[PDB]
Amino acid sequence: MLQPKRTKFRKMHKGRNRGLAQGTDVSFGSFGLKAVGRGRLTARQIEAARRAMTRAVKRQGKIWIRVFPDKPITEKPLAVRMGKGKGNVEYWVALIQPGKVLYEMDGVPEELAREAFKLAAAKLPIKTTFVTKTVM
Amino acid sequence: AKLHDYYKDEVVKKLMTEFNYNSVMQVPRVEKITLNMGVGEAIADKKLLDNAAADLAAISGQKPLITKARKSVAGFKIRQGYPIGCKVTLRGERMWEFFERLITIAVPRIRDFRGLSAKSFDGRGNYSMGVREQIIFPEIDYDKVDRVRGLDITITTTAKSDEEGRALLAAFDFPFR
Amino acid sequence: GIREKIKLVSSAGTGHFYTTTKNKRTKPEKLELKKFDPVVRQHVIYKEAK
Amino acid sequence: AHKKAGGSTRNGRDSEAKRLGVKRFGGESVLAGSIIVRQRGTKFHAGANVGCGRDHTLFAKADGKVKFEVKGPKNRKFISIEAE
Amino acid sequence: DKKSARIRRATRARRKLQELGATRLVVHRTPRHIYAQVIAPNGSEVLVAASTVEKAIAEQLKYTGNKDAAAAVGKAVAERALEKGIKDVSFDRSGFQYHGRVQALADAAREAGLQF
RNA sequence: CCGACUUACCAACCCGAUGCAAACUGCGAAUACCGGAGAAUGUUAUCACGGGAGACACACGGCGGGUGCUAACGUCCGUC
RNA sequence: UCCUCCUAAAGAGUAACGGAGGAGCACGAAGGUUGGCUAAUCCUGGUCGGACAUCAGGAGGUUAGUGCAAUGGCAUAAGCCAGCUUGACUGCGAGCGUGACGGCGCGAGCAGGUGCGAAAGCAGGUCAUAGUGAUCCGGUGGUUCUGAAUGGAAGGGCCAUC
RNA sequence: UGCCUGGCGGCCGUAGCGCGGUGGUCCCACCUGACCCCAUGCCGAACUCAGAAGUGAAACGCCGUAGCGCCGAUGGUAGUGUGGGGUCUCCCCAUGCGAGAGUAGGGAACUGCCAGGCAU
Ligand SMILES: [Mg+2]
Ligand SMILES: [Mg+2]
Ligand SMILES: [Mg+2]
Ligand SMILES: [Mg+2]
Ligand SMILES: [Mg+2]
Ligand SMILES: [Mg+2]
Ligand SMILES: [Mg+2]
Ligand SMILES: [Mg+2]
Ligand SMILES: [Mg+2]
Ligand SMILES: [Mg+2]
Ligand SMILES: [Mg+2]
Ligand SMILES: [Mg+2]
């Protein structure tokens, strides 16, 4: 369960998920999972994908999480009316723009890394793709 | 200046010959002697600090500086602005007189003597030391002082390094190993 | 609201006065200040009153 | 119950807007005493023919044309007036 | 250090004089010499100057760096300013205290005629 | 009497590579606003004073947001 | 009710039972002025003394400090220290900002009488923005005003105050 | 007129740091002494006074050198005003404006008044 250890404030505005991404390159490993669509990744979603992806490669190589849930999401309880202040923080999410690399992988063959990212992307709401490192 | 004159006639040239200094004032000279003594118990008794201040004015003929807390530290129960220490700085003839008095009379009078350490030069050549007991100075009348109270002696020198610092101290027959 | 309003009356005897506040639990001594007297158009001693 | 009673917020407070900012911009022709900028602190410093009040209000000490400029080693923003 | 501290001391009087737009008599002091310049309000041009590094002043001065040297240079600088037509200036001690030669120079200027 | 080393432990500060921010800014637009000048156009369209009002329950749509679930023909603001 | 920040869309202003915090004071010095001074933190060395007290040097450069929240500001310091002192002055007030209004705020300069400084100058409270309550009704002091036939007086008015 | 130096500015990092070298005729700085003028919560360290023996060490000035700081295009990208579209949590088209970062590069300041010293 990825989550900031402490925060300056406990609630944040809804905001908008606009623009393209920063960090669209495979900077740490050799292979990567790149987000094609935009949306929200919950810490549970990110962690479930990480379990499948690290277990797929039989605990070999190295696994990098490139995204962090830093945006808290509040939800009003069931059967409460509108107003009476903002809701309580239920979970955390990261905002995802098209092109952002979500996971990186190294130390394993490309055919195995491709299969591992397939299982991992089965857990994510956003469309993904397989990318490799390139020399700029 | 009975050791200031002693300095300028042989010690300056002595360092000159053995260190190949380009100019004579490159030979270092001690600029000041700082007499520090932090009581640390004025919080328990304000009145022991004035007596301590009188003690340091006897050993060296100067009125000491009463230092302030400068910051609140809860580990020692001090609040800033509280008198916590005693300080004197001596330069020139008064500095030389205290220096010769220390080395000739007092330093021999150190109990359980083994000399003085040569590694406490802070890396920049400035010596600092602590004497364990205070009766060693004849200025204070034995049996008239309430308690033994040591202090720290730091020799701040123009020397930029400990190697030439040791040359200055040794040329004064300072007690090195 | 520990500080309480006090009146400073001129020693020139013209009845003019200023008003201010003083903490009386500490500094219990009287307040004295050379202040301008608009009536005699001079600076005179003002003494605590009220 | 049929409805769940809510809580209460604790953040309802705010203070009035103080109408700060620049009153006359560059090129304005002002009379003496005209307020140029109302400030918290000295974001703009007083230049020639410009005075600074107790709350750091910059005002014209002469008739003329307002000019903003950057001067000094610290690149601070000064307001001066060309007398016209 | 030393020169930096002196500039920080002088800065407030220097900037206040610049704001007032007053002709400013700047005094400089060194252990061997003392310097004085009358500076135009715009601050870039000088109008008159007098110093103890000067052929005319040195022969009379027994030893430069004295209060009598300050009196000589003050009278000299004051007469030069007077004969050019400058009569009202503002003193700028340039971060020095108004005690010795700065006070001596100012005192010398008073009798000869400057208004400050 | 002050010492000199060592190992696969923890490891702060620091360096290199990565992201995030309404209550971060060593950067920074487009617009909007204020002022000066010039032409053309506009039934003075502008200001001031005075006689008379009504109105102070708004609605949806676009764009920028808070709240809600980027739920609501929801709710609360800005602007058209 | 008031102050600070965000929402608030780079002028002003801008709502919600939106997100966060404070005020109902304090100080005759913590104000005025003159002179002087410059931190946090870390390393090295040093009696008790150690992670952390006072001391010396170095690095570093405001990462400190501001009587109290937050924002903006502050080295020419608005931060720290000392001497002297009461301008925390009286009558005004060009002009301007901000409010539907009541009102609130800024202000050079003029007059009188002051303080500090050699002088140029600075000073009409405090680094600024909260620390607050209309009118009526009364209380107190003064007053070149009024005084129900006249001279007083009561009462009223004006000014200063509760 | 050339160089060196001091003061007061312009300007506000292309100008500031670091590293290396270089200067004492004059100047500058260190420096000598101090009942004294004056000063230290003590201290002639700083401030002050009386001086010029020594020295350019530090500092300061100057010269050189990119390990930094800094400045920095062209192109592209982000955004965005107006008008129009779509698969409308976000985009696209016409047109106008057009960053930030980064890159190639630049870069060891330039300059004004006066005063002094050396040289012509
Ligand atoms: Mg709150
Ligand atoms: Mg209504
Ligand atoms: Mg309504
Ligand atoms: Mg509406
Ligand atoms: Mg509706
Ligand atoms: Mg606005
Ligand atoms: Mg706007
Ligand atoms: Mg204060
Ligand atoms: Mg009658
Ligand atoms: Mg471009
Ligand atoms: Mg650019
Ligand atoms: Mg760039």
Side-chain angles (χ1 to χ4, degrees), chain D residues 9 11 13-20 32-33 35 40 42-43 45 54-55 76:
Chain D
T9 179
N11 304 315
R13 297 156 310 281
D14 193 15
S15 83
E16 289 292 301
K18 288 294 172 296
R19 277 83 173 167
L20 304 174
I35 286 168
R40 298 277 92 86
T42 61
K43 315 171 68 171
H45 288 248
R54 47 177 314 278
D55 66 279
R76 290 185 166 163

Coordinates of all heavy atoms in Angstrom, one line a residue, chain D residues 9 11 13-20 32-33 35 40 42-43 45 54-55 76, chain G residues 3-5 13 19-21 72-75 78 95-96 98-99 106-107 126 129:
Chain D
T9 N -18.5 21.7 9.9 CA -17.2 22.1 9.5 C -16.6 23.1 10.6 O -17.3 23.5 11.5 CB -17.2 22.9 8.2 OG1 -15.9 23.3 7.8 CG2 -18.1 24.1 8.2
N11 N -14.1 25.4 9.4 CA -13.2 26.3 8.5 C -14.0 27.5 8.0 O -13.6 28.0 6.9 CB -12.7 25.4 7.4 CG -11.9 24.2 7.9 OD1 -11.1 24.3 8.8 ND2 -12.1 23.1 7.2
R13 N -14.2 30.6 8.6 CA -13.8 31.9 8.7 C -13.0 32.4 7.5 O -12.3 31.6 6.9 CB -12.9 32.0 10.0 CG -13.7 31.8 11.3 CD -12.8 31.3 12.4 NE -11.9 30.3 11.9 CZ -12.2 29.0 11.8 NH1 -13.5 28.6 12.1 NH2 -11.4 28.1 11.4
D14 N -13.0 33.7 7.3 CA -12.2 34.4 6.3 C -12.2 35.9 6.7 O -13.2 36.3 7.3 CB -12.6 34.1 4.9 CG -11.5 34.5 3.9 OD1 -10.4 34.8 4.3 OD2 -11.8 34.6 2.7
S15 N -11.2 36.6 6.2 CA -11.2 38.0 6.5 C -11.5 38.8 5.2 O -11.4 38.3 4.1 CB -9.8 38.4 7.1 OG -8.9 38.6 6.0
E16 N -11.8 40.1 5.4 CA -12.2 40.9 4.3 C -11.0 41.2 3.4 O -9.9 41.3 3.9 CB -12.8 42.3 4.8 CG -14.2 42.1 5.4 CD -15.2 41.7 4.4 OE1 -15.4 42.5 3.4 OE2 -15.8 40.7 4.6
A17 N -11.3 41.4 2.1 CA -10.2 41.7 1.2 C -9.8 43.2 1.4 O -10.7 44.1 1.5 CB -10.7 41.5 -0.3
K18 N -8.5 43.4 1.4 CA -8.0 44.7 1.7 C -7.7 45.7 0.6 O -7.2 46.8 0.8 CB -6.6 44.5 2.5 CG -6.8 44.0 3.9 CD -7.6 45.0 4.8 CE -7.9 44.4 6.1 NZ -8.9 43.3 5.9
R19 N -8.1 45.3 -0.7 CA -8.0 46.1 -1.8 C -6.6 46.6 -2.1 O -6.3 47.7 -2.3 CB -9.0 47.3 -1.8 CG -10.4 47.0 -2.2 CD -11.2 46.4 -1.1 NE -12.6 46.2 -1.5 CZ -13.5 45.5 -0.8 NH1 -13.1 44.8 0.3 NH2 -14.7 45.5 -1.2
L20 N -5.6 45.7 -1.9 CA -4.2 46.0 -2.1 C -3.9 45.9 -3.6 O -4.7 45.4 -4.4 CB -3.3 45.0 -1.4 CG -3.5 44.9 0.1 CD1 -2.6 43.8 0.6 CD2 -3.2 46.2 0.8
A32 N 0.2 65.4 -6.5 CA 0.9 65.1 -5.2 C 0.0 64.5 -4.2 O -1.2 64.9 -4.1 CB 1.5 66.4 -4.7
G33 N 0.4 63.5 -3.5 CA -0.4 62.8 -2.5 C -1.1 61.6 -3.1 O -1.7 60.9 -2.3
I35 N -2.0 58.0 -4.2 CA -1.5 56.7 -3.8 C -1.2 55.8 -5.0 O -2.0 55.7 -5.9 CB -2.5 55.9 -2.9 CG1 -2.5 56.6 -1.5 CG2 -2.1 54.5 -2.8 CD1 -3.6 56.1 -0.6
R40 N 1.5 45.1 1.5 CA 2.0 44.5 2.7 C 3.5 44.3 2.6 O 3.9 43.5 1.7 CB 1.3 43.2 3.0 CG -0.2 43.3 3.2 CD -0.6 43.7 4.6 NE -0.7 45.1 4.8 CZ -1.9 45.8 4.5 NH1 -3.0 45.1 4.1 NH2 -1.9 47.1 4.7
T42 N 7.4 45.9 1.7 CA 7.9 46.7 0.6 C 8.2 45.8 -0.6 O 9.4 45.5 -0.9 CB 9.1 47.5 1.0 OG1 10.1 46.7 1.5 CG2 8.7 48.5 2.2
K43 N 7.2 45.4 -1.3 CA 7.4 44.7 -2.6 C 7.9 45.7 -3.6 O 8.8 45.4 -4.4 CB 6.1 44.1 -3.1 CG 5.3 43.3 -2.0 CD 3.9 42.9 -2.5 CE 4.0 41.9 -3.6 NZ 2.7 41.3 -4.0
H45 N 9.7 49.5 -3.7 CA 10.4 50.4 -2.9 C 10.2 51.9 -3.4 O 9.9 52.1 -4.6 CB 11.9 50.1 -2.8 CG 12.2 48.9 -2.0 ND1 12.9 49.0 -0.8 CD2 12.0 47.6 -2.2 CE1 13.1 47.8 -0.3 NE2 12.5 46.9 -1.2
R54 N 3.4 54.4 6.8 CA 3.7 53.5 7.9 C 3.3 52.1 7.5 O 4.0 51.1 7.8 CB 2.9 53.9 9.1 CG 1.4 54.3 8.8 CD 0.7 54.6 10.1 NE 1.0 53.6 11.2 CZ 0.4 52.5 11.3 NH1 -0.6 52.1 10.4 NH2 0.7 51.6 12.3
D55 N 2.2 51.9 6.7 CA 1.9 50.5 6.2 C 2.5 50.3 4.8 O 2.0 49.5 4.0 CB 0.4 50.4 6.1 CG -0.2 51.3 5.1 OD1 -0.5 52.5 5.4 OD2 -0.5 50.9 3.9
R76 N 15.8 45.1 -7.0 CA 14.5 45.5 -6.3 C 13.7 46.4 -7.2 O 14.3 47.2 -8.0 CB 14.8 46.1 -5.0 CG 15.4 45.0 -4.0 CD 15.5 45.6 -2.6 NE 15.7 44.5 -1.6 CZ 16.2 44.7 -0.4 NH1 16.5 45.9 0.1 NH2 16.4 43.7 0.4
Chain G
rC3 P -11.1 42.2 8.7 OP1 -10.7 43.4 7.9 OP2 -12.0 41.2 8.2 O5' -9.8 41.5 9.2 C5' -8.7 42.2 9.7 C4' -7.6 41.3 10.1 O4' -7.9 40.4 11.1 C3' -7.0 40.4 9.0 O3' -6.2 41.1 8.1 C2' -6.3 39.3 9.7 O2' -5.1 39.7 10.2 C1' -7.2 39.2 11.0 N1 -8.2 38.1 10.8 C2 -7.8 36.8 10.9 O2 -6.6 36.5 11.1 N3 -8.7 35.8 10.7 C4 -10.0 36.1 10.5 N4 -10.8 35.0 10.3 C5 -10.4 37.4 10.4 C6 -9.5 38.4 10.5
rU4 P -6.1 40.6 6.5 OP1 -5.1 41.6 5.8 OP2 -7.4 40.4 6.0 O5' -5.3 39.2 6.7 C5' -4.0 39.2 7.1 C4' -3.4 37.8 6.9 O4' -3.8 36.9 7.9 C3' -3.8 37.1 5.6 O3' -3.1 37.5 4.4 C2' -3.5 35.6 6.0 O2' -2.1 35.4 5.9 C1' -3.9 35.6 7.4 N1 -5.3 35.2 7.6 C2 -5.6 33.8 7.5 O2 -4.7 33.0 7.4 N3 -6.9 33.5 7.6 C4 -8.0 34.3 7.7 O4 -9.1 33.8 7.7 C5 -7.6 35.7 7.7 C6 -6.4 36.1 7.6
rC5 P -3.8 37.3 3.0 OP1 -3.0 38.1 2.0 OP2 -5.2 37.6 3.1 O5' -3.6 35.8 2.7 C5' -2.3 35.2 2.7 C4' -2.3 33.7 2.6 O4' -2.9 33.1 3.8 C3' -3.2 33.1 1.4 O3' -2.5 33.2 0.2 C2' -3.5 31.7 1.9 O2' -2.4 30.9 1.7 C1' -3.6 31.9 3.4 N1 -5.0 32.1 3.8 C2 -5.8 30.9 3.9 O2 -5.3 29.8 3.7 N3 -7.1 31.1 4.2 C4 -7.7 32.3 4.4 N4 -9.0 32.3 4.7 C5 -6.9 33.4 4.4 C6 -5.6 33.3 4.1
rG13 P -9.1 42.5 -3.7 OP1 -8.8 42.8 -2.3 OP2 -8.4 41.4 -4.4 O5' -10.7 42.2 -3.9 C5' -11.7 43.1 -3.4 C4' -13.0 42.8 -4.0 O4' -12.9 43.1 -5.5 C3' -13.5 41.4 -3.9 O3' -14.2 41.2 -2.7 C2' -14.4 41.3 -5.1 O2' -15.7 41.8 -4.9 C1' -13.7 42.1 -6.1 N9 -12.8 41.3 -7.0 C8 -11.4 41.2 -6.9 N7 -10.9 40.3 -7.7 C5 -12.0 39.9 -8.4 C6 -12.1 38.9 -9.5 O6 -11.1 38.3 -10.1 N1 -13.4 38.8 -10.0 C2 -14.5 39.4 -9.4 N2 -15.6 39.1 -10.0 N3 -14.4 40.2 -8.4 C4 -13.2 40.4 -8.0
rG19 P -14.4 21.9 4.9 OP1 -14.6 20.5 5.4 OP2 -14.8 23.0 5.8 O5' -12.9 22.1 4.4 C5' -12.3 21.2 3.5 C4' -10.9 21.6 3.3 O4' -10.9 22.9 2.5 C3' -10.0 21.8 4.5 O3' -9.5 20.6 5.0 C2' -8.9 22.8 3.9 O2' -8.0 22.0 3.2 C1' -9.7 23.6 2.9 N9 -10.2 24.9 3.5 C8 -11.4 25.2 3.9 N7 -11.5 26.5 4.3 C5 -10.2 27.0 4.1 C6 -9.7 28.3 4.3 O6 -10.2 29.3 4.8 N1 -8.3 28.3 4.0 C2 -7.6 27.3 3.4 N2 -6.3 27.6 3.1 N3 -8.1 26.1 3.2 C4 -9.4 26.0 3.6
rA20 P -9.5 20.4 6.6 OP1 -9.3 18.9 6.8 OP2 -10.7 21.0 7.1 O5' -8.3 21.2 7.2 C5' -8.4 22.5 7.6 C4' -7.0 23.2 7.5 O4' -7.1 24.3 6.6 C3' -6.6 23.9 8.8 O3' -6.0 23.0 9.7 C2' -5.6 25.0 8.3 O2' -4.4 24.4 7.9 C1' -6.3 25.4 7.0 N9 -7.2 26.5 7.3 C8 -8.6 26.5 7.4 N7 -9.2 27.7 7.6 C5 -8.1 28.5 7.6 C6 -8.0 29.9 7.8 N6 -9.1 30.7 8.0 N1 -6.8 30.5 7.7 C2 -5.7 29.7 7.5 N3 -5.7 28.4 7.4 C4 -6.9 27.9 7.4
rG21 P -6.2 23.2 11.3 OP1 -5.7 22.0 12.0 OP2 -7.5 23.7 11.5 O5' -5.2 24.4 11.6 C5' -5.5 25.4 12.5 C4' -4.7 26.7 12.3 O4' -5.2 27.4 11.1 C3' -4.8 27.7 13.4 O3' -3.9 27.4 14.4 C2' -4.4 29.0 12.6 O2' -3.0 29.1 12.4 C1' -5.1 28.7 11.3 N9 -6.4 29.4 11.2 C8 -7.6 28.7 11.1 N7 -8.7 29.5 11.1 C5 -8.1 30.8 11.1 C6 -8.7 32.0 11.1 O6 -9.9 32.3 11.0 N1 -7.8 33.1 11.1 C2 -6.4 32.9 11.2 N2 -5.7 34.0 11.2 N3 -5.8 31.7 11.2 C4 -6.7 30.7 11.2
rG72 P 4.5 34.8 1.1 OP1 4.7 34.2 -0.3 OP2 5.3 34.3 2.2 O5' 4.7 36.4 1.0 C5' 4.3 37.1 -0.1 C4' 4.2 38.6 0.2 O4' 3.5 38.8 1.4 C3' 5.6 39.2 0.5 O3' 6.3 39.6 -0.7 C2' 5.2 40.4 1.3 O2' 4.7 41.5 0.5 C1' 4.0 39.9 2.1 N9 4.5 39.3 3.4 C8 4.8 38.0 3.7 N7 5.3 37.8 4.9 C5 5.4 39.1 5.4 C6 5.8 39.5 6.6 O6 6.3 38.8 7.6 N1 5.8 40.9 6.8 C2 5.3 41.7 5.8 N2 5.3 43.0 6.1 N3 4.9 41.3 4.6 C4 4.9 40.0 4.5
rG73 P 7.9 39.5 -0.6 OP1 8.4 40.0 -1.9 OP2 8.3 38.1 -0.2 O5' 8.4 40.5 0.5 C5' 8.3 41.9 0.3 C4' 8.6 42.7 1.5 O4' 7.8 42.1 2.7 C3' 10.0 42.6 2.0 O3' 10.9 43.5 1.3 C2' 9.9 43.0 3.5 O2' 9.7 44.4 3.7 C1' 8.5 42.3 3.9 N9 8.7 41.1 4.6 C8 8.6 39.8 4.0 N7 8.9 38.9 4.9 C5 9.1 39.5 6.1 C6 9.5 39.0 7.3 O6 9.6 37.9 7.7 N1 9.7 40.1 8.3 C2 9.6 41.4 8.0 N2 9.8 42.2 9.0 N3 9.3 41.9 6.8 C4 9.1 40.9 5.9
rC74 P 12.4 43.2 1.0 OP1 12.9 44.1 0.0 OP2 12.5 41.7 0.7 O5' 13.2 43.4 2.4 C5' 13.1 44.7 3.0 C4' 13.5 44.6 4.5 O4' 12.5 43.8 5.2 C3' 14.8 44.0 4.8 O3' 15.9 45.0 4.6 C2' 14.6 43.6 6.2 O2' 14.8 44.7 7.1 C1' 13.2 43.2 6.2 N1 13.0 41.7 6.1 C2 13.1 40.9 7.3 O2 13.3 41.5 8.4 N3 13.0 39.6 7.2 C4 12.8 39.0 6.0 N4 12.7 37.7 5.9 C5 12.7 39.8 4.8 C6 12.9 41.1 4.9
rA75 P 16.8 44.8 3.3 OP1 16.7 46.1 2.5 OP2 16.6 43.5 2.7 O5' 18.3 44.9 4.0 C5' 18.8 46.0 4.7 C4' 20.2 45.8 5.1 O4' 20.2 44.8 6.2 C3' 21.2 45.3 4.1 O3' 22.5 45.9 4.3 C2' 21.2 43.8 4.3 O2' 22.4 43.2 3.9 C1' 21.1 43.7 5.8 N9 20.5 42.5 6.3 C8 19.2 42.0 6.0 N7 18.9 40.9 6.6 C5 20.1 40.6 7.3 C6 20.4 39.5 8.1 N6 19.6 38.4 8.3 N1 21.6 39.4 8.6 C2 22.5 40.4 8.4 N3 22.3 41.5 7.6 C4 21.0 41.5 7.1
rA78 P 16.1 49.3 11.1 OP1 15.7 50.7 11.1 OP2 16.9 48.8 12.2 O5' 14.8 48.4 11.1 C5' 13.7 48.6 12.0 C4' 12.7 47.5 11.9 O4' 11.9 47.7 10.7 C3' 13.3 46.1 11.9 O3' 12.4 45.2 12.6 C2' 13.3 45.8 10.4 O2' 13.2 44.4 10.1 C1' 12.0 46.5 9.9 N9 12.0 46.9 8.5 C8 13.0 47.7 8.0 N7 12.8 47.9 6.7 C5 11.6 47.2 6.4 C6 10.9 47.0 5.2 N6 11.2 47.6 4.1 N1 9.8 46.3 5.3 C2 9.5 45.7 6.5 N3 10.1 45.8 7.7 C4 11.2 46.6 7.6
rG95 P -7.3 69.1 -2.7 OP1 -8.0 69.7 -3.8 OP2 -7.9 68.9 -1.4 O5' -6.7 67.7 -3.2 C5' -5.8 67.6 -4.3 C4' -4.9 66.4 -4.2 O4' -4.2 66.4 -3.0 C3' -5.6 65.1 -4.2 O3' -6.0 64.6 -5.5 C2' -4.5 64.2 -3.6 O2' -3.5 63.9 -4.5 C1' -4.0 65.1 -2.5 N9 -4.7 64.9 -1.3 C8 -5.7 65.7 -0.7 N7 -6.2 65.2 0.4 C5 -5.5 64.1 0.6 C6 -5.5 63.1 1.7 O6 -6.3 63.1 2.7 N1 -4.6 62.1 1.5 C2 -3.7 62.0 0.5 N2 -2.9 60.9 0.5 N3 -3.7 62.8 -0.5 C4 -4.6 63.8 -0.4
rC96 P -7.4 63.9 -5.7 OP1 -7.7 63.8 -7.1 OP2 -8.4 64.5 -4.7 O5' -7.1 62.4 -5.2 C5' -6.0 61.7 -5.7 C4' -5.5 60.5 -4.9 O4' -5.2 61.0 -3.5 C3' -6.6 59.4 -4.6 O3' -6.7 58.6 -5.7 C2' -6.0 58.8 -3.3 O2' -4.9 57.9 -3.7 C1' -5.4 60.0 -2.6 N1 -6.4 60.5 -1.6 C2 -6.6 59.7 -0.4 O2 -5.9 58.7 -0.2 N3 -7.5 60.2 0.5 C4 -8.2 61.3 0.3 N4 -9.0 61.7 1.2 C5 -8.0 62.0 -0.9 C6 -7.2 61.6 -1.8
rU98 P -9.6 52.2 -4.8 OP1 -9.3 51.0 -5.6 OP2 -10.3 53.4 -5.4 O5' -10.3 51.8 -3.5 C5' -9.9 50.8 -2.7 C4' -10.7 50.6 -1.4 O4' -10.5 51.8 -0.5 C3' -12.2 50.6 -1.6 O3' -12.7 49.3 -2.0 C2' -12.7 51.0 -0.3 O2' -12.7 50.0 0.7 C1' -11.7 52.1 0.2 N1 -12.1 53.4 -0.1 C2 -12.9 54.1 0.8 O2 -13.3 53.5 1.8 N3 -13.3 55.3 0.5 C4 -13.0 56.0 -0.7 O4 -13.4 57.2 -0.8 C5 -12.2 55.3 -1.6 C6 -11.8 54.1 -1.3
rG99 P -14.0 49.2 -2.9 OP1 -14.0 48.1 -3.7 OP2 -14.3 50.6 -3.5 O5' -15.1 49.0 -1.7 C5' -16.4 49.6 -1.7 C4' -16.9 49.8 -0.3 O4' -16.0 50.7 0.4 C3' -18.3 50.4 -0.1 O3' -19.3 49.4 -0.3 C2' -18.2 51.0 1.3 O2' -18.3 49.9 2.2 C1' -16.8 51.5 1.3 N9 -16.8 52.9 0.8 C8 -16.2 53.4 -0.3 N7 -16.4 54.7 -0.4 C5 -17.2 55.1 0.7 C6 -17.6 56.3 1.1 O6 -17.5 57.4 0.6 N1 -18.3 56.2 2.3 C2 -18.5 55.0 3.1 N2 -19.2 55.2 4.2 N3 -18.1 53.9 2.7 C4 -17.4 54.0 1.5
rC106 P -3.4 54.8 8.8 OP1 -2.3 54.1 9.5 OP2 -4.1 55.9 9.5 O5' -2.8 55.5 7.5 C5' -2.1 54.7 6.5 C4' -1.7 55.4 5.3 O4' -2.9 55.8 4.5 C3' -1.0 56.7 5.4 O3' 0.4 56.6 5.8 C2' -1.2 57.4 4.1 O2' -0.3 56.8 3.1 C1' -2.6 56.9 3.7 N1 -3.6 58.0 4.1 C2 -3.8 59.1 3.2 O2 -3.1 59.1 2.2 N3 -4.7 60.0 3.5 C4 -5.4 60.0 4.6 N4 -6.2 61.0 4.8 C5 -5.2 58.9 5.5 C6 -4.4 58.0 5.2
rG107 P 1.1 57.7 6.7 OP1 2.5 57.2 7.0 OP2 0.2 57.9 7.9 O5' 1.1 59.0 5.9 C5' 1.8 59.0 4.6 C4' 1.4 60.2 3.8 O4' 0.0 60.2 3.5 C3' 1.7 61.6 4.4 O3' 3.0 62.0 4.3 C2' 0.7 62.4 3.6 O2' 1.2 62.7 2.3 C1' -0.5 61.5 3.4 N9 -1.5 61.7 4.5 C8 -1.7 60.9 5.5 N7 -2.7 61.3 6.3 C5 -3.2 62.4 5.7 C6 -4.2 63.3 6.0 O6 -5.0 63.2 7.0 N1 -4.3 64.3 5.1 C2 -3.6 64.5 4.0 N2 -3.8 65.6 3.3 N3 -2.6 63.7 3.7 C4 -2.4 62.7 4.5
rU126 P 3.8 53.1 14.0 OP1 4.4 53.2 12.6 OP2 2.4 52.7 14.2 O5' 4.7 51.9 14.7 C5' 6.0 52.2 15.1 C4' 6.6 51.3 16.1 O4' 5.6 51.3 17.3 C3' 6.6 49.8 15.7 O3' 7.8 49.2 16.4 C2' 5.3 49.2 16.3 O2' 5.4 47.8 16.6 C1' 5.2 50.0 17.6 N1 3.8 50.1 18.1 C2 3.5 49.3 19.2 O2 4.3 48.6 19.7 N3 2.2 49.4 19.6 C4 1.2 50.2 19.0 O4 0.1 50.2 19.5 C5 1.6 51.0 17.9 C6 2.9 50.9 17.5
rU129 P -0.9 48.1 10.7 OP1 -1.7 49.3 10.8 OP2 -0.3 47.5 12.0 O5' -1.9 47.0 10.1 C5' -2.5 47.2 8.8 C4' -2.9 45.9 8.2 O4' -1.8 45.0 7.9 C3' -3.8 45.0 9.0 O3' -5.2 45.4 9.0 C2' -3.6 43.6 8.4 O2' -4.4 43.5 7.2 C1' -2.1 43.7 8.0 N1 -1.3 43.1 9.1 C2 -1.1 41.7 9.0 O2 -1.5 41.0 8.0 N3 -0.3 41.1 10.0 C4 0.2 41.8 11.0 O4 0.9 41.2 11.8 C5 0.0 43.2 11.1 C6 -0.8 43.8 10.1

